[PDB]
Design an enzyme around this catalytic site. Sequence first.
Site: not given
Ligand SMILES: NS(=O)(=O)c1ccc2c(c1)C1=C(CCC1)[C@@H](c1ccc(O)cc1)N2
Ligand SMILES: [Zn+2]
Length: 257
Positions: A61, A91, A195-196
């Site tokens: 991603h 990232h 955001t994912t």
């Molecule tokens: N584009 S963003 O900065 O909003 C972003 C997006 C997804 C993420 C992350 C940061 C990091 C983790 C959660 C917090 C920060 C990870 C995740 C969370 C929980 C989970 O169960 C699987 C993966 N995923």
């Molecule tokens: Zn991000």
Amino acid sequence: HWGYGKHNGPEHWHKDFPIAKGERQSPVDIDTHTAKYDPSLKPLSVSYDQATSLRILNNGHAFNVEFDDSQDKAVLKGGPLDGTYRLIQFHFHWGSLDGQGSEHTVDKKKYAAELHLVHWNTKYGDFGKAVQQPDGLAVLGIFLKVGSAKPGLQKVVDVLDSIKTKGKSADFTNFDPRGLLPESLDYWTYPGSLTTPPLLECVTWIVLKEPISVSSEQVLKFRKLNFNGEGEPEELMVDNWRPAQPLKNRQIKASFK
Ligand SMILES: NS(=O)(=O)c1ccc2c(c1)C1=C(CCC1)[C@@H](c1ccc(O)cc1)N2
Ligand SMILES: [Zn+2]
Ligand SMILES: NS(=O)(=O)c1ccc2c(c1)C1=C(CCC1)[C@H](c1ccc(O)cc1)N2
């Protein structure tokens, strides 16, 4: 599973992650005229002098630069935050063209890319517990525009050839994330989400007003990454951004007049 293609992109995510249509989704458009200056907001404290970078990973991603978060080494405090938030990873999101790539927008302007420095609230003990709380994470968002090179990004750019495909990692010790910041720490803040997927509503967003400049050559190397694994058909890792979501019952606050 989920991704950024026509068949698995942001319009599809709500089928497996129904919080996608929730009340505090990110990113958002920052309407600079409607954001209110909040003089009660504190300066942000970004304390990265003891940061310990470990590794860089292509997760299919984006790429993540991961940190040792087992102690208060690289922390974010102040601004809208209560308590101490530890840096776990950063990232980027970026476009196929310089006219798009950011997740947040500013008066509908899209930047070429957006950096996310992800931090978790130490009162919850670990990242997995923090993402289950409304104040679990603080993500520092920084816009990238194309112009002059960013010296402090070049070590990132030069390792990307070694993590071209999904699931590849590389050693990435002694990287100083202070080299990715702009001069000013003026910011907007609002409550939002990842955001994912899983799109959890656990983030205090802190978006800096001043973009950093990166060169055309630097962002071109982001665009040579692959979403696919080794030995799979090549799909360039570009346009890995979610579009702005409805603001709903939220106020964006500004740290500056
Ligand atoms: N584009 S963003 O900065 O909003 C972003 C997006 C997804 C993420 C992350 C940061 C990091 C983790 C959660 C917090 C920060 C990870 C995740 C969370 C929980 C989970 O169960 C699987 C993966 N995923
Ligand atoms: Zn991000
Ligand atoms: N709500 S969601 O965004 O998580 C979602 C959306 C579309 C999907 C799927 C799950 C999954 C596919 C195979 C495994 C998981 C598939 C797909 C389509 C196109 C594609 O490029 C890859 C996979 N149909």
